Point group: C4
């Protein structure tokens, strides 16, 4: 059951990368 966990974790990370890109766009809209 490691693999079903690792799978979700990968998916979790990928959300965090997508969040980082939302915050890159936002920081630029903000003048930083």
């Amino acid at each position: 059951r490691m693999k079903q966990i690792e799978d979700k974790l990968e998916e979790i990370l990928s959300k965090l990368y997508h969040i980082e890109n939302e915050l890159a766009r936002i920081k630029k809209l903000l003048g930083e």
Copy 2:
């Protein structure tokens, strides 16, 4: 405990989609203003 883990996984995944959608609304609000 695996069920518990798996709940916790999902609960994290939901707060992530919620986070992403509150960011995406902030982003739209700054892009149109």
Copy 3:
């Protein structure tokens, strides 16, 4: 080794709650 994982997961969640509070403060500073 479930418990060492569940532990980190709890900790992960707690970060996400803290992020939500950062975004509550920010949304109000933004007029929403």
Copy 4:
């Protein structure tokens, strides 16, 4: 795989502290402006 899991846990935990700190800088920037 547990080592892999444990790496992945930590990698998520780092992007979380990084996320939190970029939010905290945005928050300061809007509170002082």
